[PDB]
Amino acid sequence: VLSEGEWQLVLHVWAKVEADVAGHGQDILIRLFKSHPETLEKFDRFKHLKTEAEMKASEDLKKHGVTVLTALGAILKKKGHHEAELKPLAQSHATKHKIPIKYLEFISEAIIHVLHSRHPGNFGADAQGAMNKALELFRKDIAAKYKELGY
Incomplete structure (x- = not known):
């Protein structure tokens, strides 16, 4: 669970x-x-x-x-x-696109790297931590549907 303050940094x-x-x-x-x-x-x-x-x-x-x-x-x-x-995304990425969960970690690293690169001032370590958490939540929830579907 992210706090309200964490969501605000993310958004x-x-x-x-x-x-x-x-x-x-x-x-x-x-x-x-x-x-x-x-x-x-x-x-x-x-x-x-x-x-x-x-x-x-x-x-x-x-x-x-x-x-x-x-x-x-x-x-x-x-x-x-x-x-x-998440429902349609997890269904298509598991079954049609065949995207490992690991790749979602990779795109998360790329998102962080670029956000860091383009908004230093609104992406200090606090905001980076909040963004990490939001992306992890997303991954966790996707992974749960993967396991359901036999990935």
Whole structure:
């Protein structure tokens, strides 16, 4: 459980991500794909991208950055009450996309790395801790549906 004060730190920094969703989504996905190349292989649509320059130039990648960050933003704003949201995501990612829970930890590290990089002043260690917690909660809840489904 996050405290109300923890949620405010989380949503304060996300309100800022929301100032440039597409720039954030880009940076986060490139970070993910470069740090953890196995992740890129799960996207048929992105497997042709070899270089960082190619990734940065991809409009479709940028579009997908917006897609994931938008879903995440909607989840965070439920402040833990995200049951309706997690259901379809867990179902598709376990069964259709075949995404290990571990990869959700990877995208969380990438999110933190970039948020750190773009809002030093609203992402001190306190806000970083709060964001860690929110992302962990999400992972925990997803993992529970994975185990239910036999992943």
